Amino acid sequence: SRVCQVTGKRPVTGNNRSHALNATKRRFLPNLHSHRFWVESEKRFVTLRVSAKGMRVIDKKGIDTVLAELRARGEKY
């Protein structure tokens, strides 16, 4: 499901407001991209379905820290 494994980001509903101001139900998907991250500490690639915000979080926190969070909530990878 269009869901980022790092942050939880998933689609959200809002409106399209026309110029006349007509609302219309729409969605806002996240910027998901499945990506192979090299985990040195496991001599293995782990590919994640992440949002770019996700990448940014992996870059800062550190993959080993992020993978741990998933492991913590029994999220599989």
Binding site: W38, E40, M55, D59, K60
Partner: protein, 149 residues
């Protein structure tokens, strides 16, 4: 990101600098093939401990792989008991493990392959000279005197 490097790294790196690189390059190439690493601050001081140690300390220790030769010119003369044929011309002859082993065996402790006797010292008798090696740039001269006893 910032990221601090590991190996030399081409048109940007150094060996342990704090450059700044496009994340596409850091993830996907550098850090994976451990040529650099996230500048997580935690790290940037992991490197400040590494900015005092090996450098400031173990180069005034090569100021000891150097001041070994402050005791190369303060004696400046070992004698070898090697005699003389038919006119004060060595009945013996002295090389490197002769001029490093007859150097070590006193208060002048050198590593046997740290004694450069040009095709010389030993060939004939009397005074000669040699090139004593402890550092790559700082060696030092002495005087050798093959004594015909």
């Amino acid at each position: 990101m910032q990221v601090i490097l590991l190996d030399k790294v081409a048109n940007l790196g150094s060996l342990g600098d704090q450059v700044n690189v496009k994340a596409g390059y850091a993830r996907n190439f550098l850090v994976p093939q451990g040529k650099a690493v996230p500048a997580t601050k935690k790290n940037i001081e992991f490197f400040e401990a590494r900015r005092a140690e090996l450098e400031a300390k173990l180069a005034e220790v090569l100021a000891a792989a150097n001041a070994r030769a402050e005791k190369i010119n303060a004696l400046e003369t070992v004698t070898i008991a090697s005699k003389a044929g038919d006119e004060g011309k060595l009945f013996g002859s002295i090389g490197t493990r002769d001029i490093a082993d007859a150097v070590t065996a006193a208060g002048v402790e050198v590593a046997k392959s740290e004694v450069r006797l040009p095709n010389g010292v030993l060939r004939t008798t009397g005074e000669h000279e040699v090139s004593f090696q402890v550092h790559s740039e700082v060696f030092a001269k002495v005087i050798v005197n093959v004594v015909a006893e």
